[PDB]
Amino acid sequence: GPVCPFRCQCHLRVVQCSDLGLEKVPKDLPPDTALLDLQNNKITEIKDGDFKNLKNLHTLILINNKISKISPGAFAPLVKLERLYLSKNQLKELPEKMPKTLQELRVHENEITKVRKSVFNGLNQMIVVELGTNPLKSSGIENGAFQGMKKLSYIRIADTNITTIPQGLPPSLTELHLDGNKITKVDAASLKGLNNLAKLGLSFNSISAVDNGSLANTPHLRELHLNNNKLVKVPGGLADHKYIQVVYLHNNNISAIGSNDFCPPGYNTKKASYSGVSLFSNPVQYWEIQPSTFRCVYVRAAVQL
Amino acid sequence: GPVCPFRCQCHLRVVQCSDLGLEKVPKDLPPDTALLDLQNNKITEIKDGDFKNLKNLHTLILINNKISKISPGAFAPLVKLERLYLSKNQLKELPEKMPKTLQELRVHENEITKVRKSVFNGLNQMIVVELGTNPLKSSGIENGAFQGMKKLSYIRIADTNITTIPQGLPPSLTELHLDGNKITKVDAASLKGLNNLAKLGLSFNSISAVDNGSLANTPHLRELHLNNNKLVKVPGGLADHKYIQVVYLHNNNISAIGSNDFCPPGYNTKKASYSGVSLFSNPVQYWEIQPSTFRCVYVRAAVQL
Numbered sequence: 310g311p312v313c314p315f316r317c318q319c320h321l322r323v324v325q326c327s328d329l330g331l332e333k334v335p336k337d338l339p340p341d342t343a344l345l346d347l348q349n350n351k352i353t354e355i356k357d358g359d360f361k362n363l364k365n366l367h368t369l370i371l372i373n374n375k376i377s378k379i380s381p382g383a384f385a386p387l388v389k390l391e392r393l394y395l396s397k398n399q400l401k402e403l404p405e406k407m408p409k410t411l412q413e414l415r416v417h418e419n420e421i422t423k424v425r426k427s428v429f430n431g432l433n434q435m436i437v438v439e440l441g442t443n444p445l446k447s448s449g450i451e452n453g454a455f456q457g458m459k460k461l462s463y464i465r466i467a468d469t470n471i472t473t474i475p476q477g478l479p480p481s482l483t484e485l486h487l488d489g490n491k492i493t494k495v496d497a498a499s500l501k502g503l504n505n506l507a508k509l510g511l512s513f514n515s516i517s518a519v520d521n522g523s524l525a526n527t528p529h530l531r532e533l534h535l536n537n538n539k540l541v542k543v544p545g546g547l548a549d550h551k552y553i554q555v556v557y558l559h560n561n562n563i564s565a566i567g568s569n570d571f572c573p574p575g576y577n578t579k580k581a582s583y584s585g586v587s588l589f590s591n592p593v594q595y596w597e598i599q600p601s602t603f604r605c606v607y608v609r610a611a612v613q614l
Numbered sequence: 615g616p617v618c619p620f621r622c623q624c625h626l627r628v629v630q631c632s633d634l635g636l637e638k639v640p641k642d643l644p645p646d647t648a649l650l651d652l653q654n655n656k657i658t659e660i661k662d663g664d665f666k667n668l669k670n671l672h673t674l675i676l677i678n679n680k681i682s683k684i685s686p687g688a689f690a691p692l693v694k695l696e697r698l699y700l701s702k703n704q705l706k707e708l709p710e711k712m713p714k715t716l717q718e719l720r721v722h723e724n725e726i727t728k729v730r731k732s733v734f735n736g737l738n739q740m741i742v743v744e745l746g747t748n749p750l751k752s753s754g755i756e757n758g759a760f761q762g763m764k765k766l767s768y769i770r771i772a773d774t775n776i777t778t779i780p781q782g783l784p785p786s787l788t789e790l791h792l793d794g795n796k797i798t799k800v801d802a803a804s805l806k807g808l809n810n811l812a813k814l815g816l817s818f819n820s821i822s823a824v825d826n827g828s829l830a831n832t833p834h835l836r837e838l839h840l841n842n843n844k845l846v847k848v849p850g851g852l853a854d855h856k857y858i859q860v861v862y863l864h865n866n867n868i869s870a871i872g873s874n875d876f877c878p879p880g881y882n883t884k885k886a887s888y889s890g891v892s893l894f895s896n897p898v899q900y901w902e903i904q905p906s907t908f909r910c911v912y913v914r915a916a917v918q919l
């Protein structure tokens with residue numbers, strides 16, 4: 310006989326237990342539960358028995374609890390789990406042995422200091438990972454830690470203590486968001502192999518330089534946000550890059566702008582047209598840029614000086 | 615041309631924009647969006663244009679923002695909205711003119727001080743309402759404020775400042791949860807007409823007495839939680855009530871227990887059997903209760919002394 314905990318609402322394969330101050334995961338829940346919402350409670354840990362007989366559960370929300378420890382494989386019995394939301398908790402590290410069906414993991418606002426490559430081995434259905442707002446440091450991220458996710462399309466590590474782009478990122482990535490960290494430079498090695506990367510967010514960091522060859526490793530990149538950093542000049546490779554269309558560089562320390570910083574010498578029919586370029590809040594003024602600098606842009610609205 | 619905001623993920627009619635520090639609701643979202651997640655951002659208000667062309671949106675999550683004002687009818691254009699989650703914000707009152715399709719509203723942990731009967735007029739699809747953790751006072755709740763919801767099945771006002779059960783509750787109610795408030799007494803008037811009420815949670819309040827005739831107004835009540843209150847004796851009407859099965863009275867100030875406090879004189883075949891009764895953490899001891907007191911209970915496990 311399955312029971313709905315007192316105060317929780319159990320309707321249509323949805324078990325709603327938010328805002329109840331629960332101190333641990335309820336048991337004896339309906340075997341067919343598809344979505345379990347345990348948000349805003351006082352759960353301190355996930356024990357090995359906590360999720361038994363929840364074989365149809367595709368979504369688990371544990372956002373805003375006080376979780377400081379999760380037994381290895383505690384989520385394993387959730388053979389159909391696609392979304393796991395552990396944001397706003399007190400995790401010290403990511404949970405080991407998670408369902409191989411997992412498509413999205415969010416562990417925003419925790420106390421992560423180490424990202425073991427082992428937690429991600431085999432998770433081949435994973436497409437989105439959000440690990441922002443953690444005291445994590447670049448040293449805490451094992452190299453190739455995310456390599457195991459052959460389908461990963463999006464990853465975001467924001468407002469943490471990392472200082473360099475993680476090495477060994479899965480080549481399936483289309484979006485890499487590292488806004489609001491403490492990155493100081495962009496090395497070509499970290500972006501090596503990201504042939505599918507379309508968006509690269511590096512805004513609000515402390516970047517002072519972008520090695521030549523960097524953007525060339527992301528040949529199909531369409532959006533580059535580097536605003537609010539410490540750049541002394543526009544990153545190189547924009548003129549010979551063929552797919553870049555959006556380049557945000559406002560709020561930096563760019564001294565001057567070369568004639569071929571964005572457009573190549575002769576018109577290149579193969580280079581995609583720029584749809585947006587931002588340069589305001591920089592030392593350079595509109596009067597220090599030769600009108601020829603944006604000769605490959607055919608919309609005045611695009612360039613914002 | 616619909617756009618997915620930078621850093622948000624837009625996949626399968628789901629727009630995911632949690633944890634991005636956004637300062638306002640994004641516009642130009644895909645017209646077919648069914649679920650919009652704006653949790654954990656910095657949105658301060660909902661303007662009248664914020665939700666245009668989101669006609670298929672059945673779920674809106676704005677949990678954990680800094681919302682302090684919502685224009686009247688701002689949610690009106692969401693003609694198919696079934697769930698609205700506004701918990702963890704800074705609302706001073708509930709929003710006027712909400713979609714008539716609304717099935718669930720959660721405004722837990724806000725700064726609600728007044729519940730106008732007008733916000734709920736016409737919301738005939740509403741089945742669940744959670745208004746816990748607000749500085750709300752009994753005076754701030756207009757009488758019959760919830761009357762307008764002819765399908766309301768569950769309502770919860772917990773950890774607030776109310777001191778009396780709200781008057782004029784919809785008779786469709788099956789669950790009334792008022793745990794953790796400052797209620798001092800249970801008057802029969804407030805429970806008048808609740809012929810469908812199955813569960814009544816009044817735990818963790820300051821109740822010192824239950825008027826006779828109270829439980830008789832909830833003739834089909836199956837669960838009564840009155841633990842952690844200031845009761846001087848078991849509430850009356852339990853013996854002649856026919857459906858009550860669970861009566862939690864632990865952590866009170868009950869002096870003694872009468873012979874017919876739970877069971878009527880002669881065995882009543884029409885009275886449902888008790889499946890759970892709690893009396894521990896009270897002045898009375900197991901040796902002050904005549905064994906005849908629970909003569910209509912046929913499971914020793916039921917009574918917890």
Ligand SMILES: *[C@@H]1O[C@H](CO)[C@@H](O)[C@H](O)[C@H]1NC(C)=O
Pocket residue numbers: 442443444445468469470
């Ligand atoms: C970075 O780590 C230090 C300790 O090493 C900590 O004090 C600081 O809060 C962290 N920064 C962030 C924003 O996580």
Ligand SMILES: *[C@@H]1O[C@H](CO)[C@@H](O)[C@H](O)[C@H]1NC(C)=O
Pocket residue numbers: 521545
């Ligand atoms: C980057 O390449 C450009 C070639 O256009 C060159 O002028 C510049 O000095 C290079 N950066 C350095 C210092 O390696």
Ligand SMILES: *[C@@H]1O[C@H](CO)[C@@H](O)[C@H](O)[C@H]1NC(C)=O
Pocket residue numbers: 539541561562564
């Ligand atoms: C900008 O660069 C100049 C040298 O090129 C340096 O002196 C100055 O401190 C920089 N401004 C910033 C970002 O503080």
Ligand SMILES: *[C@@H]1O[C@H](CO)[C@@H](O)[C@H](O)[C@H]1NC(C)=O
Pocket residue numbers: 747748749750773774775
């Ligand atoms: C009750 O209201 C008072 C002000 O009238 C406030 O100080 C107090 O925090 C409120 N109690 C709760 C738990 O909301």
Ligand SMILES: *[C@@H]1O[C@H](CO)[C@@H](O)[C@H](O)[C@H]1NC(C)=O
Pocket residue numbers: 826850
């Ligand atoms: C409640 O009803 C009982 C009848 O069993 C009676 O003994 C009691 O005095 C009544 N409470 C009061 C004081 O109204």
Ligand SMILES: *[C@@H]1O[C@H](CO)[C@@H](O)[C@H](O)[C@H]1NC(C)=O
Pocket residue numbers: 844846866867869
């Ligand atoms: C319990 O009731 C007695 C009188 O019946 C009273 O003196 C005492 O203060 C009460 N205990 C509590 C709940 O403080």
